Design a protein around this nucleic acid. Structure first.
Ligand SMILES: [Mg+2]
Ligand SMILES: [Mg+2]
Ligand SMILES: [Zn+2]
Ligand SMILES: [Zn+2]
Ligand SMILES: [Zn+2]
Lengths: 97, 178, 558, 112, 87, 107, 171, 275
DNA sequence: TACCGATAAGCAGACGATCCTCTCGAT
DNA sequence: ACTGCTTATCGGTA
RNA sequence: UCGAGAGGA
C-alpha cells in the first residue's frame, strides 16, 4: 500500500521522525552501497569476500564507507550520473552554517 | 577502520604528494608539527630503538597493574625471558607482531637503563634536528661523522662535521653494557 | 541492509556536492569498452563484451559481475564509457552554453567586460552564484567587439592595454540542436552591408571554453573542480549499467530490453557511422549530416520532450523514454518513488462503525492480523510466550510466520522440517502476528491535516472489515458508505513507541488548527443525548441498573 | 504594513466560510512570504527559487531543471532539510530527530 | 568550528523534557531493553519493554544524555535526570 | 535631502552617487503630501547602530543573512534613509502576545 | 622511526553490553582490533599506550537500532618505514635469490643483485650461507640494511632493502 | 504548494521559528510561543465596560470610608484602613490596571475582549472554590501584601524564553504582555476578595496551578509548525462551498486564495475602502 | 548627432485531489 | 489554467 | 510490463 506525499507530510507534522524513516526504508526500499570518500560516487568495487574494496580511478582501499539509502535514491544518483551530473555523496561536514 | 588524527582536506582525487624518502619527505600523516587529542599543535614524537623499548615496557608494566586492579572486585638475557612472560599476561598470543617487536627492541637497544636514555634524549632533542634524525642517531651506532651523514642523508649541510662528531663521541660514553 | 556484513564503516551522508562529470574521470571510472551495439548473444548467448555485462552489472541468475560477483541483489552496477566521435552539447546546458558564448569573447577565450568597466565591478559585487551571472550576462550580451585599450577617465586621456585580440563577437541564435553566429564588419569593405553567417560547431565552442580563464569561471558562477564550463560539452558519455536499464526475463530464450538499452545502442549506431566517416574519405557535408544525428540521439537519450521543433519515435510510432522524463516530477522517481512509496507491513479494507469499541481502538480482521507481522526479539520477558506462539504456527491466532536466527536466516514455519521443534535462543527475532493492544498507524486518504493518520490500539475481530469508533469519524472525515482505509504496522519498539507517545488518538483530541477539540459525540449518540438529557424523562430501577453496569469505570455505588 | 494587509486578506477568506484557523498558522505563512524583503509567490518561480538546498527544491515542479542548474552552478545541498533526509532515507532532524541521544558511563555505573 | 558545545552551566534551553525527547528516550530504552540491555530499575514482573522503559523514567535511572542542537551547530548536553517531566 | 516638484532628469541623478560619505536623497512633493508612517497598518521602525546590531547577531546566534530582510526602496526604509547592512527593530501590536519585536536588515 | 601517534577509532557497541563493565569491555575491544593491526596509512600499531585515561566520552545510540557509536580517542606506538631509512635487523630466511631480515615486526628482503657482486651464495652449507672472506651471512647474523622500496600488502608492510653501499653490510 | 513552502519551517531549541537553511521567520512561534492546543478564548475584563464600573470593581482605597475593603472580606480589614504604606502598593496595582485598559484598547481597536489565550483562569478559580470548599460567610486568611505581591511574583516565573541579556529579557517580557494583562484583570486584589473569596491556602495553590499550566502551554522545540500551518490552512480550503450589502460581488472562496498565493497582478475585484 | 534609457510587440516552459479497484490491445 | 520574460521602434539627453 | 479505457469515498 502506497505511503504517498500526503502520508509523509502528515508524519512530519506529528514529529515522528523514526517511524517516517522506518516506513521509507525498512518497510520498502533500503539499500547498502559502498561510496568513495575521495569522490562521493558509487564507483566503489565492493568485494565482500576478497576485501579488494578499491574504487578504480581513485586507487584508494582505505577512504571507503558503506551507506544505507533507498534503492530508488541509488537509481536516482545513477540516472544523474548517466546524464553527466555528479551527485557526490559526502560523509564529512565542511561549511558549519 | 582506524583512519583519524590528522584528517582533511580532500578536494577531488589529489596528486598523492611525493614518494616517502629519507629526504625527510615522510608520510602526509607524519608531519614535523602535527596535532593533539586536546587540540594543541604538538611536534612529531619519534622514538629511537632505546626510547621505544622503555616506552612499551613502561606501558605494559603499568597495563598489568590496572589489569589486575579490576581482577579484585637490568641483565641482558634475563630481560628477554621476563618480557616474554609479560607479553602473555598483558596481551593475547594473537598479537605476534608485538612479540617480534619486543624481541628485536631488547636485542638492538643502544641504551638499556632509563637514566642514560634520559641524557641521550636531552643531548639529541637539543641539536636542532628533525625528530626522525634524532630517532635514527639514537638507534644506529656511528663512529664517523661521514658514517652518520651517509646513513642519515637528511643531515649533510644541516650539522657541522666536527660538531656532529662531539655528539657521536658523547654517545659512545653513554653506551650501556650488554 | 543490502544483505551480508561489510568490514567498511557505516556513516550518515552529511552533505551532497553537485557538479559535472569530467570526460577524463568517466574514462577512469569506467569498467566497459562498449565497442559493439548488440545487447544479448556473443552471436551465440550470455551478452557480448560490447553493450551489457562486458565487465559491469550482471544479468539473469549469474553473479559474474567484474570478478566481484556478489549477485543481482547486492550488485549496484558499474558505469561504462562511450567515446563520442565528435564532441556534442548537453540538452540541459543548451541556453547556458549560448549565454556563456554571448558572455566570454571568442578567438581569445577571455571575458568581454573587465574590472575597468564600473558596471562590471557593480555586477561582480555580489558573491552569489547565478544572480551574479545574471548581471554578467546582460552586461556582456551587448558591446559586440572584444577590446585592447579602454580607460580614458581614471587615467589622463590615453587608453591603456588590458585585453587580447579585438575581434567582433557575433549575435548567436538557436537553429534547433545547433547555434549559429552572425559577424558584422561590412564598413565600406566586404559583403556590402549584409552580415556574415557561420555554423558554430561544438569543437570550436569547446576550444574557446577550454581557453576560458580560471577567474572567468568564478565570475560566471562555475567551479574550478566540480563544474568546469568545458564539461557542459560531452566528449565521453557514461553508460549506465543494467540496474538502471534492466534487460527483463522474457521466458527461457528471448530478450525484452529496456527503452534506455535501445536508445544507447541508437547512439552507438550514429557514433560508429561517424567513427568510419571521419577516418575514411571525408565527404565534408556528409559527416555533419550524421553528426547532427549523433547530437540528436545523445539529446533525446537525456531529454526527448525537447523544445518545440524536434521529436524521436522508437517504432512502433510511439516515442522513447528519456532520463529527464524518468525522474520528472509527479509519480516519477522524485515524486513517485522517493517522496512517497509502496510499503510492506500494510493493509486496506472497507471501514465500519462501532459503539462497543474504544475511541483509540481499532478492529483488525483475523485475515489481516494473520497476514501482517511484528518482529519481536527473544528476551527472558517473552520466550515461553514466543515459544507457544512459534508452536501455533502461521495458521493459529497468536502464531508467527518466520523465525530469525543469530545468523541471517528466516524460518518459514509454513514449510520447514524443524517447524514443530525450534528451541528459540535469545536475541533471535520472531515474526509474530499482530495481537491486541498493538499500537498501529491508521489512515484515510486524502490525508489533509496532522490527524487522519492516528495511532490505534489493535482489537482482533471477526469479519473482513476495519472496525472504528464512531467518535473518531470527524478527524478522518469518513462515512461508512463503502469507504476504504489504510493501516501501517510498525516494525521497531522505537517506531511503535513514537506512535503511542505522540500519534495516539486520545493525545490528538484537541486540534491545534482551530484551538478547539476535533472529536465529538455524533449521530445516535448525539440524537439520544438530547432525548435523555431533559426533565421530562426518568428511568426506573430495572433499566437503571443495566445503564450503570454498562459504564466500565463505575464506582459500584447506586 | 504589506504583511499586515496580507494577513487581513488571507484571514478574510478563512473567515468567509467556516471559522477559523489560529492566528499563528496564517501569521507563519504571511511572515514566510514577507521575511524575504518583498512578496514571495507560492509558486514554481516564487518560493522554489530560494537559497535552499538543491534536493529540497527539485522535489517541487522544477526537477531536472534544478538538478542541472545544481550541477552547472556546482551547488552543495547542506542536508539540513526535511526533503533531502527523506530522499537519503535517514532520520530527519524533525521533532524526535531534532537531537542526538548518547549514553553516559558516569551515570551507568552510578545506577548499577 | 574547533570543538563547540555549551558548558553544563549557562543554558538557554527549557529545563522541562520535550514531548519528542520523552518519546525518543522511552522508545530507545524500550528498544534497548527489547535488544537485551541491562535494566536499572527493579522489575515488577514486567513482560513489556516499554512498560519497563516508562518505569526507568519514573525512578530516573536511565543513563541517557540528550544533545540539544542549536541552529548554529552549538549544543547543550542535558542528562535525563536534569529534565523535569511535566508534559 | 533634496525635494523636487515634478521630475528630476536621470542626468541630474548621475552626479548623485558621487561625493562620499555625504548621503544625498531625492523625494517628490506628492510622495511627501501624506505621511506613510502615520498609517494604521505601518508599525514602529527603529534604526540600530553597529553597537546595537552586533549584540543582536551574537545573542540570537544569527549570521547576518539569516535575519529577515527589508527592501532598500521600501517607503519606511527611505523614511529613515538607511543603507545596506542597517537593521531595524519593528515593534507591532500582536493579537496574541500584546507586542512583538521583529528585525529587518536592509538591501 | 618508531612513532607515537595519538589517533582514534570509532566502535559500535551492542545494547546488551550497556552494563557497569562497559568501559573495560570497550577499552579491550580497542586493543582487540587496533593492537597488532597494521595499515598502509599509519604502519604496524604495536602497543596502545596508557590503559588508564583512554577517552571514551559519549556514544551516540544509532537511529533505528539501539547500538551506540563510541569514538575511542587513544595514543599508541607505530612502526611505519620509509624508502631510504637505514635499519639494522637480523637475517631469518636465506636462499639463491637473497635473504630476508626481521627488522621489528617487518621482514626486509635483500636481492643477490642488491648486495655486493664479490659475495655469491653457498648452497653446500647448513644453514645456507653468503660468504666472501671472514664475512658470512647465515640463519642469525645481524646486518645493516638501507630500505630501497616499501610495499603495503594486506596488514603487513614489507620492504626490498640494499646492503651494497658504504657503511652498510654486516654488523 | 502550502505544505511544500513550509516543510523546513520548525520551532528550534532557542525558541525561534527558523527553517532548513536557518533563516528566522518568527523570533517566537505565533509571536507568543504557545502550543496552539493549550489555548482557550478568554475575555479581558479590563478593556470591556464603562470607566465607572471599572473604577467600581477594581479600585481599592484604604484611605476611604466607602471605597475600602469591608473587614468581612479581609481578616485584617479594620487595621489596614488609612495605611499609607499598603495603599501605595494598591495605587501601584490600580495604576498598572489603568495602563492595561489604555494598552489593550490600542491593540484591540474594535473593543473585542474574547481572545485566544493560554491558562484557563475562569476555571482555575472555579476549581479552587470547590477544591477548598470556601465559604462567603467567613473572611480571607490573605493580606494585601500577600495578594498584590504574590501576583507580581507569579508574573516573574511565567517563562517562555530563558535569558541573561537585554534582548532575550525584553523578548520574554514582550512574549507574555497580553497574558499577564489578563492575569492582572483576573487576580486584582479587589476581585480576589469581592467575587472569588479566596483563602491563603487556595490562593497560593492557584498561583502554583497557573504557573504549572503556563509552562505546559509553551511550544515544544521540534514542533513542525510550518507543515502544521500549511495543513491547517489547506484543510478548510477543501470545504469551501461558495466561490463568490458588502458590495454585491467581491472575490472570496477558493479562487481568491489562487490570487493571494500566485502573487497576483489580477483585477477581479480590486475595490478599495476610503474612510 | 552619438547615445540611453522608455513602453510596447511578441513566445515559452513548466504544472493542475490523495489513495483505491477493475478490463482490453501489441508493433 | 497566470503573470511572466525577451526583444522591435523611438523621443530626447547634451 | 507498457499504453489506453473503465470504476470508486
Ligand atoms: Mg544550495
Ligand atoms: Mg464520503
Ligand atoms: Zn572515487
Ligand atoms: Zn558488481
Ligand atoms: Zn578576443
Amino acid at each position: 500500500l502506497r505511503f504517498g506525499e500526503m502520508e509523509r507530510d502528515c508524519m512530519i507534522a506529528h514529529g515522528a521522525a523514526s517511524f517516517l524513516k522506518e516506513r521509507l526504508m525498512e518497510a520498502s526500499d533500503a539499500f547498502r552501497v559502498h561510496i568513495c570518500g575521495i569522490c562521493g560516487l558509487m564507483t566503489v568495487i565492493a568485494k565482500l569476500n576478497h576485501n579488494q574494496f578499491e574504487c578504480k580511478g581513485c586507487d584508494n582501499k582505505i577512504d571507503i564507507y558503506q551507506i544505507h539509502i533507498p534503492y530508488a535514491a541509488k537509481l536516482l544518483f545513477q540516472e544523474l550520473m548517466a546524464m553527466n551530473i555528479t551527485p557526490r555523496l559526502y560523509t564529512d561536514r565542511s561549511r558549519d552554517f | 577502520s582506524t583512519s583519524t588524527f590528522q584528517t582533511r582536506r580532500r578536494r577531488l582525487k589529489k596528486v598523492e604528494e611525493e614518494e616517502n624518502a629519507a629526504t625527510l619527505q615522510l608520510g602526509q600523516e607524519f608531519q614535523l608539527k602535527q596535532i593533539n587529542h586536546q587540540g594543541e599543535e604538538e611536534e612529531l614524537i619519534a622514538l629511537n630503538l632505546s626510547e621505544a623499548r622503555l616506552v612499551i615496557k613502561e606501558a605494559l608494566v603499568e597495563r598489568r597493574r590496572a589489569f589486575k586492579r579490576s581482577q579484585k572486585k637490568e641483565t641482558r638475557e634475563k630481560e628477554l625471558e621476563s618480557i616474554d612472560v609479560l607479553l602473555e599476561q598483558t596481551t593475547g598470543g594473537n598479537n605476534k607482531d608485538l612479540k617480534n617487536t619486543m624481541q628485536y627492541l631488547t636485542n638492538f637497544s643502544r641504551f638499556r637503563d632509563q637514566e642514560t636514555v634520559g641524557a641521550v634524549i636531552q643531548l639529541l632533542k637539543s641539536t636542532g634536528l628533525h625528530p626522525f634524525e634524532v630517532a635514527q642517531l639514537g638507534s644506529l651506532a656511528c663512529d664517523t661523522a661521514d658514517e652518520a651523514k651517509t646513513l642519515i642523508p637528511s643531515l649533510n649541510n644541516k650539522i657541522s662535521d666536527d660538531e656532529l662528531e662531539r655528539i657521536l663521541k658523547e654517545l659512545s660514553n653513554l653506551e650501556t653494557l650488554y | 541492509v543490502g544483505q551480508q556484513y561489510s568490514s567498511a564503516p557505516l556513516r550518515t551522508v552529511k552533505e551532497v556536492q553537485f557538479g559535472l562529470f569530467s570526460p577524463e574521470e568517466v574514462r577512469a571510472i569506467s569498467v566497459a569498452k562498449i565497442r559493439f551495439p548488440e545487447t544479448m548473444d556473443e552471436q551465440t548467448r550470455a551478452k557480448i563484451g560490447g553493450l551489457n555485462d562486458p565487465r559491469l552489472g550482471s544479468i539473469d541468475r549469474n553473479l559474474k559481475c567484474q570478478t566481484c560477483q556478489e549477485g543481482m541483489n547486492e550488485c549496484p552496477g558499474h558505469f561504462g564509457h562511450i567515446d563520442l566521435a565528435k564532441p556534442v552539447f548537453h540538452v540541459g546546458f543548451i541556453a547556458k552554453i549560448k549565454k556563456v558564448c554571448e558572455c566570454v569573447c571568442m578567438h581569445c577565450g577571455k571575458l568581454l567586460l573587465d574590472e575597468h568597466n564600473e558596471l562590471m565591478r557593480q555586477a561582480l559585487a555580489i558573491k552569489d552564484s547565478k544572480k551574479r551571472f545574471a548581471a554578467i550576462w546582460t552586461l556582456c550580451k551587448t558591446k559586440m567587439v572584444c577590446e585592447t585599450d579602454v580607460p580614458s577617465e581614471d587615467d589622463p586621456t590615453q587608453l591603456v592595454s588590458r585585453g587580447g585580440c579585438g575581434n567582433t563577437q557575433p549575435t548567436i541564435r538557436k537553429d534547433g540542436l545547433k547555434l549559429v553566429g552572425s559577424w558584422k564588419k561590412d564598413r565600406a569593405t566586404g559583403d556590402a552591408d549584409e552580415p556574415e553567417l557561420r555554423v558554430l560547431s561544438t569543437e570550436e565552442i569547446l576550444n574557446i571554453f577550454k581557453h576560458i580563464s580560471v577567474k572567468d569561471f568564478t565570475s560566471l558562477g562555475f567551479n574550478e573542480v566540480f563544474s568546469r564550463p568545458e564539461w557542459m560539452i560531452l566528449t565521453c558519455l557514461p553508460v549506465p549499467p543494467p540496474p538502471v536499464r534492466p534487460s527483463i526475463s522474457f521466458n527461457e530464450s528471448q530478450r525484452g530490453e529496456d527503452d534506455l538499452t535501445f536508445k544507447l545502442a541508437d547512439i552507438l549506431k550514429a557514433n560508429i557511422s561517424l567513427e568510419t566517416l571521419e577516418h575514411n574519405g571525408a565527404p565534408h557535408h556528409a559527416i555533419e549530416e550524421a553528426e547532427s544525428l549523433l547530437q540528436f540521439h545523445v539529446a533525446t537519450y537525456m531529454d526527448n520532450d525537447i523544445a518545440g521543433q524536434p521529436q524521436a519515435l522508437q517504432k512502433s510510432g510511439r516515442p522513447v523514454k528519456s532520463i529527464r522524463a524518468r525522474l520528472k516530477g509527479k509519480e516519477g522517481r522524485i515524486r513517485g518513488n522517493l517522496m512517497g512509496k509502496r510499503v510492506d507491513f500494510s493493509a486496506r479494507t472497507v471501514i465500519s462503525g462501532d459503539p462497543n469499541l474504544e475511541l483509540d481502538q481499532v478492529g483488525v480482521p483475523k485475515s489481516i492480523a494473520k497476514t501482517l507481522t511484528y518482529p519481536e526479539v527473544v528476551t527472558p520477558y517473552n520466550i515461553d510466550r514466543l515459544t507457544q506462539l512459534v508452536r501455533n504456527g502461521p495458521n493459529e491466532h497468536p502464531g508467527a510466520k518466520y523465525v530469525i536466527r543469530d545468523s541471517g536466516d528466516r524460518i518459514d514455519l509454513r514449510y520447514s522440517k524443524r517447524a514443530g521443534d525450534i528451541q528459540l535462543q535469545y536475541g533471535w527475532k520472531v515474526e509474530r502476528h499482530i495481537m491486541d493492544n498493538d499500537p498501529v498507524l491508521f489512515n484515510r486518504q486524502p490525508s489533509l491535516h496532522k490527524m487522519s493518520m492516528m495511532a490505534h490500539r489493535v482489537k482482533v475481530i471477526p469479519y473482513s472489515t476495519f472496525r472504528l469508533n464512531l467518535s473518531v469519524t470527524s478527524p478522518y472525515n469518513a462515512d461508512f458508505d463503502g469507504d476504504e482505509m489504510n493501516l501501517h504496522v510498525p516494525q521497531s519498539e522505537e517506531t511503535r513507541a513514537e506512535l503511542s507517545q505522540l500519534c495516539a488518538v486520545p493525545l490528538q483530541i484537541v486540534s491545534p488548527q482551530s484551538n478547539k477539540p476535533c472529536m465529538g459525540i455524533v449521530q445516535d449518540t448525539l440524537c439520544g443525548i438530547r432525548k435523555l438529557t431533559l426533565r421530562d424523562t426518568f428511568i426506573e430501577l430495572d433499566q437503571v441498573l443495566n445503564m450503570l453496569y454498562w459504564v466500565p469505570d463505575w464506582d459500584g455505588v447506586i | 504594513a504589506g504583511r499586515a494587509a496580507l494577513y487581513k486578506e488571507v484571514y478574510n477568506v478563512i473567515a468567509s466560510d467556516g471559522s477559523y484557523v489560529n492566528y499563528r498558522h496564517m501569521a507563519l505563512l504571511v511572515d514566510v512570504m514577507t521575511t524575504q524583503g518583498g512578496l514571495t509567490s507560492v509558486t514554481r518561480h516564487g518560493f522554489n527559487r530560494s537559497n535552499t538546498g538543491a534536493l529540497m527544491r527539485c522535489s517541487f515542479e522544477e526537477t531536472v531543471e534544478i538538478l542541472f542548474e545544481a550541477g552547472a552552478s556546482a551547488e552543495l545541498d547542506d542536508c539540513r532539510g526535511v526533503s533531502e533526509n527523506v530522499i537519503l532515507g535517514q532520520m530527519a532532524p524533525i521533532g524526535t530527530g531534532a537531537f542526538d541521544v548518547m549514553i553516559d558511563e558516569e551515570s551507568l555505573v552510578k545506577y548499577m | 568550528l574547533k570543538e563547540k558545545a555549551i558548558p553544563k552551566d549557562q543554558r538557554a534551553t527549557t529545563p522541562y523534557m520535550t514531548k519528542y525527547e520523552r518519546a525518543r528516550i522511552l522508545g530507545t530504552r524500550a528498544l534497548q531493553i527489547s535488544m537485551n540491555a541491562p535494566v536499572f530499575v527493579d522489575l515488577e514482573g514486567e513482560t513489556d519493554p516499554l512498560r519497563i522503559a516508562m518505569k526507568e523514567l519514573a525512578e530516573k535511572k536511565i543513563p541517557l544524555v540528550i544533545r540539544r542542537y542549536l541552529p548554529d551547530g552549538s549544543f547543550e548536553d542535558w542528562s535525563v535526570e536534569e529534565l523535569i517531566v511535566d508534559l | 535631502i533634496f525635494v523636487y516638484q515634478n521630475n528630476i532628469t536621470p542626468s541630474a541623478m548621475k552626479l548623485v552617487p558621487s561625493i562620499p560619505p555625504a548621503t544625498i536623497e531625492t523625494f517628490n512633493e506628492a510622495a511627501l503630501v501624506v505621511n506613510i508612517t502615520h498609517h494604521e497598518l505601518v508599525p514602529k521602525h527603529i534604526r540600530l547602530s553597529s553597537d546595537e546590531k552586533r549584540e543582536l547577531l551574537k545573542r540570537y546566534r544569527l549570521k547576518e543573512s539569516q535575519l529577515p530582510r527589508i527592501q532598500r526602496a521600501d517607503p519606511v526604509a527611505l523614511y529613515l534613509g538607511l543603507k545596506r547592512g542597517e537593521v531595524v527593530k519593528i515593534i507591532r501590536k500582536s493579537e496574541t502576545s500584546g507586542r512583538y519585536a521583529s528585525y529587518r536588515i536592509c538591501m | 622511526m618508531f612513532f607515537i601517534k595519538d589517533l582514534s577509532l570509532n566502535i559500535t557497541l551492542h545494547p546488551s553490553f550497556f552494563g557497569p563493565r562497559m568501559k573495560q569491555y570497550l577499552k579491550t575491544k580497542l586493543l582487540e582490533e587496533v593492537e597488532g593491526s597494521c595499515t598502509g596509512k599509519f604502519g604496524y600499531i604495536l602497543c596502545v599506550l596508557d590503559y588508564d585515561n583512554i577517552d571514551i566520552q559519549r556514544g551516540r545510540i544509532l537511529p533505528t537500532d539501539g547500538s551506540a557509536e563510541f569514538n575511542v580517542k587513544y595514543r599508541a606506538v607505530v612502526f611505519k618505514p620509509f624508502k631510504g631509512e637505514v635499519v639494522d635487523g637480523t637475517v631469518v630466511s636465506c636462499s639463491q635469490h637473497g635473504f630476508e631480515v626481521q627488522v621489528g615486526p617487518m621482514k626486509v628482503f635483500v636481492t643477490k643483485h642488491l648486495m655486493p657482486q664479490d659475495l655469491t651464495f653457498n648452497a653446500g652449507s647448513n644453514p645456507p650461507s653468503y660468504q666472501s672472506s671472514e664475512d658470512v651471512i647465515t640463519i642469525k647474523s645481524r646486518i645493516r640494511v638501507k630500505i630501497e622500496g616499501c610495499i603495503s600488502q594486506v596488514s603487513s608492510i614489507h620492504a626490498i632493502g640494499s646492503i651494497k653501499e658504504d657503511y652498510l653490510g654486516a654488523i | 504548494r502550502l505544505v511544500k513552502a513550509l516543510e523546513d519551517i520548525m520551532v528550534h531549541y532557542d525558541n525561534t521559528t527558523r527553517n532548513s537553511l536557518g533563516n528566522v521567520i518568527q523570533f517566537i512561534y505565533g509571536e507568543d510561543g504557545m502550543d496552539a492546543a493549550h489555548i482557550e478564548k478568554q475575555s479581558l475584563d479590563t478593556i470591556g465596560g464603562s470607566d465607572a464600573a471599572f473604577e467600581k470593581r477594581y479600585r481599592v482605597d484604604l484611605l476611604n470610608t466607602d471605597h475600602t475593603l469591608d473587614p468581612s472580606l479581609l481578616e485584617s480589614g479594620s487595621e489596614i484602613l488609612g495605611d499609607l504604606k499598603l495603599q501605595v502598593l494598591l495605587d501601584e496595582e490600580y495604576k498598572q490596571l489603568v495602563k492595561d485598559r489604555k494598552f489593550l484598547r490600542e491593540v484591540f481597536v474594535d473593543g473585542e475582549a474574547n481572545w485566544p489565550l493560554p491558562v484557563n483562569i475562569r476555571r482555575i478559580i472555579q476549581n479552587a472554590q470547590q477544591t477548598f470548599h470556601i465559604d462567603h460567610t467567613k473572611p480571607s486568611d490573605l493580606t494585601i501584601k500577600d495578594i498584590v505581591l504574590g501576583v507580581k511574583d507569579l508574573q516573574e516565573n511565567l517563562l517562555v524564553l530563558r535569558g541573561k541579556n537585554e534582548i532575550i529579557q525584553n523578548a520574554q517580557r514582550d512574549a507574555v504582555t497580553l497574558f499577564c494583562c489578563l492575569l492582572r484583570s483576573r487576580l486584582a486584589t479587589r476581585r480576589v476578595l469581592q467575587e472569588y473569596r479566596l483563602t491563603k491556602q487556595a490562593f497560593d495553590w492557584v498561583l502554583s496551578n497557573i504557573e504549572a499550566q503556563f509552562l505546559r502551554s509553551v511550544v515544544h522545540p521540534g514542533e513542525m509548525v510550518g507543515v502544521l500551518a500549511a495543513q491547517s490552512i489547506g484543510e478548510p480550503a477543501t470545504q469551501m462551498t461558495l466561490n463568490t450589502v458588502a458590495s454585491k460581488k467581491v472575490t472570496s472562496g477558493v479562487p481568491r486564495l489562487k490570487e493571494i498565493l500566485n502573487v497576483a497582478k489580477n483585477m477581479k475585484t480590486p475595490s478599495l475602502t476610503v474612510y
